[PDB]
Amino acid sequence: LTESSTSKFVKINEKGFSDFNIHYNEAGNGETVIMLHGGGPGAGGWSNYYRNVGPFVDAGYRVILKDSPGFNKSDAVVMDEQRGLVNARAVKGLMDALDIDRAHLVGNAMGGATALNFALEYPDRIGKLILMGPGGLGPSMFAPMPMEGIKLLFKLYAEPSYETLKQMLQVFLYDQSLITEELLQGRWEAIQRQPEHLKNFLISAQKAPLSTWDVTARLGEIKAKTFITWGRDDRFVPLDHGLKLLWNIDDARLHVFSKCGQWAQWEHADEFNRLVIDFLRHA
Amino acid sequence: LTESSTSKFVKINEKGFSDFNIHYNEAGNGETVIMLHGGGPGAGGWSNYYRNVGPFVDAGYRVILKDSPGFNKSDAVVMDEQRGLVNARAVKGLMDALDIDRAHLVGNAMGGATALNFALEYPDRIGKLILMGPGGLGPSMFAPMPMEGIKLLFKLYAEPSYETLKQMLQVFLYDQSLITEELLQGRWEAIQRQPEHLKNFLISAQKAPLSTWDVTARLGEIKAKTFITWGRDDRFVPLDHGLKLLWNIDDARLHVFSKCGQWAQWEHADEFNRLVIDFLRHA
Amino acid sequence: LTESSTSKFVKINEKGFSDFNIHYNEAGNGETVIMLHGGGPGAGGWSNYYRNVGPFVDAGYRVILKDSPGFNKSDAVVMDEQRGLVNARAVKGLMDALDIDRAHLVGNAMGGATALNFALEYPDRIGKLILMGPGGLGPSMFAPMPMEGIKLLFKLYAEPSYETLKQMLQVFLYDQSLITEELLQGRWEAIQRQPEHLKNFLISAQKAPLSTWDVTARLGEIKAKTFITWGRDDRFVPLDHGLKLLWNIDDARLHVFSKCGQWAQWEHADEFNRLVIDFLRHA
Amino acid sequence: LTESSTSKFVKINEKGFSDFNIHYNEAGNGETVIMLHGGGPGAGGWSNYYRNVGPFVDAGYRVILKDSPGFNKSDAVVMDEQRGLVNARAVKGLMDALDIDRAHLVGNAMGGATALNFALEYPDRIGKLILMGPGGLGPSMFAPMPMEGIKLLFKLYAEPSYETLKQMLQVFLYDQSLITEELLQGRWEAIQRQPEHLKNFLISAQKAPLSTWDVTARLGEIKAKTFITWGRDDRFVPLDHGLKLLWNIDDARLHVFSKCGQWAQWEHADEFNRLVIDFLRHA
Ligand SMILES: O=C([O-])C(=O)/C=C/CC(=O)c1ccccc1
Ligand SMILES: O=C([O-])C(=O)/C=C/CC(=O)c1ccccc1
Ligand SMILES: O=C([O-])C(=O)/C=C/CC(=O)c1ccccc1
């Protein structure tokens, strides 16, 4: 499978979206799993999940790697509401447009906030919920905020450069030897190709600070069976938020990977793929 | 499979053990997995693991559910050293006696301490290590000690009664409806059948307090791939010890079950069996 | 100072209170400090704070040890709303009735919930806020709930007995040698004297469960300078809630006493008195 | 009081120190309190504690602000043993040289490690122990290591520059408006004046990594009454280590300041001074 062979576009119409262009990459034809990426500069569905799409398709799922509004090849946007909710509306718009009745959701960081908001707003449209270090869940009981990684994420948004991208990635990943020229150049190309996304994200952050993303108080509403994953060494979203989710969602379990930053699906791809596929099949 | 059809005995000879009788239950004939039980009154291999033995045997393993010294049908003993280490020596004695070169270990509570000590003392004789809320790992950062469950465990040892057994089990299990007459009577029979074990455990606890079981300082020695499981609602061993293990063992991962006490292999048997079998096969 | 010489009554009129009798003990004549007790069977202002009233009066404060509605010598009541808020309304009623414009509040456990609700509802009427292990602040990130102490509190409410009172107190206090016959008999007399309070508390708990007391989401509203105290060994309210308060209240500090249960003002009275008096004078 | 008027030197002779020059600043003449600074580039006694020396002297103490070996105006040194222990030996050498029988110790970060090692090695020579976010106490249960602040500390040691110093200080302090030109230039002058200290610290860190400083296992030996302080927002040493100390030292208490980095004695100087002076007088 390749980015080019899987690349598709769909115009969505949902709440404050009118003929809004959403890019996604699709492979497979069984039960739909939508995978949702984080909010760092240059993020997109394919680069976030290219170690997972193949195994999930082999397991018999239809995988949609969605570009969230204001990222990658999806349309530019300035949001005045918290991104989790807006992104979630875009997932519903995509699903309606493609006649998908129900989807399993996989979401890391911002994508985890998206998946949470979706499970809250559209409970009849979600199957199972897989959350990898979701962002915006309020203060940590131990970690000073903004977290180290978030500071670097802001700095890259405001002053984008190849060196700052590398600094960010070194914080993002536990194992530094995963940062090849291919990963760096690829992410750098996504940033260079869409400078408008960077300035818009910063404007959006002014209109709706991270505190506005905190849906903690509503977690008890979630009826989806939930699989929470965390990197032990995540410097972007605090480990104790894995416990917050585990205590507040009805049917949840928590899996924490050692020697792992925010990108468990990349750093521990084999174990991640087996666990989540097993959860989707049998939980 | 039944307790009676699987029941076996072997005399062990290791360090301070001479012709010491060890009871165990064995089924299957592939790779050996030894499963080790907790230290509560009436504990034994078969009752601790009777929801897991079948699935593991179906997966192709040879399962040995071991009675630790001073429990169930194994010989009576008063230990002056911490139980984890003494139990571990008994596992080595059993393995030598049965010509088992290497075993995967599964250990809950006291059995988790046993498995840890084994991995430390006999690294060449362990495959993978599965730890379910191991006891004796020093103070908690949050939980006052002795933990609620430990107080009840002591009270049952000192003043054994059917009502006190029921109180203990209600604390042991998250889901109270799992406490059937069959579970209660069975555990009660094990207590009635071997009163000597109860008095000996209390004597042993005087000679070697729980503080003496703490092997935290040596966790960095463990080279076994390790799967740590915890019940979110464990009132016997503190949840933050799952983090302690995850930070200090080289290759570890942590899985926490919601709505689960100390007995994850019983309360969440299906998920537990799938996760651990997958870990043994693929990690 | 004695309970009898300080004992006073006042009829209050506030929201759902009409000619409702509030008992309190008052000494001193400077700045008013109102001290608010926990919700255990037989609790009251004088017994909760009799090691603190003298030192605070010597420091120049007017101390009012308030009996909350449905406790001690205050009127009986069945509450259908969370107790923190109802208690807080009663504090306002007392203050209006006595022409007290502003008070410093000291609150342990339920009394801490009372003080929090007061700071939220009547910000113009509070000086400084002193919180000792306040109850009802939602789930713990580490402690299974109901906490051990809460289970005993329920059992004493439902099946009051001298032995069960002693069991509760042994959990309540770190240092068991503080449980003299005088403390036990005194608390027992308060329970025997007002059986109606016990049945009413249980009825109230059915109408408004502990989950309904959780004011976490509003903590950011508190403008009072806040001093949070915790017992390290508190088995009633979880230590991580001290962090929850410290992260969410604007101007807070946290002091944790070693070898201390829920009753820091009793177990560490000298240090407690010096710290809080210093805070009231200088913070 | 000024740095110049208080500045003194003494040659020490203790274990591996022979005629080793120690600089310190001394004022007052009552009970001796020795204050020990952190290990960041340009650290020294006077700059670390210049908001505390006056109030402590006014309270009646003799204050010695010690420069640790390899810092400020004390002699250069390359250490092959963990710095806490070596620094502690230097404190004993200073005390012997000055005929001080017993001292109260105040230690932040590295200075907290120094004070801990001193309390362990020379229990007969310490009064009370005041610890402000001591470093080197092993892994955190929540914080990835090296902590954000430590990474910046290394970067400043390796590539010293005024901009990198400012970056470090912005992380060091919660309130950025405390970073005046005076603080920056002063710290910068200390770095420029002694480049040898920077290269030696890095060499020492290679010979004795931070893991070698971990004295956790011996904390139970400490008989000194201990006051542990932490900044809630400390990005150099993890907040859960405050709990580690509180659980493992016999007579300890923990005070956590909101809106505070590693430098509580500077950011919350008034409250810090009152608390510690009160502790020294009355605990
Ligand atoms: O690949 C990415 O999207 C990435 O590098 C970082 C994402 C961070 C992120 O989504 C985040 C959002 C809010 C709070 C914390 C974290
Ligand atoms: O089935 C059992 O063995 C049981 O009920 C409890 C075991 C507790 C246990 O092994 C334990 C030992 C040390 C510390 C904490 C827990
Ligand atoms: O003296 C007392 O009031 C006492 O023994 C216990 C009080 C517990 C209490 O107020 C509480 C309320 C809600 C949640 C946790 C704790």
Ligand SMILES: O=C([O-])C(=O)/C=C/CC(=O)c1ccccc1
């Ligand atoms: O003023 C200073 O010394 C400073 O900026 C930082 C000190 C950090 C420090 O002593 C430290 C040492 C080991 C581990 C963590 C922290």
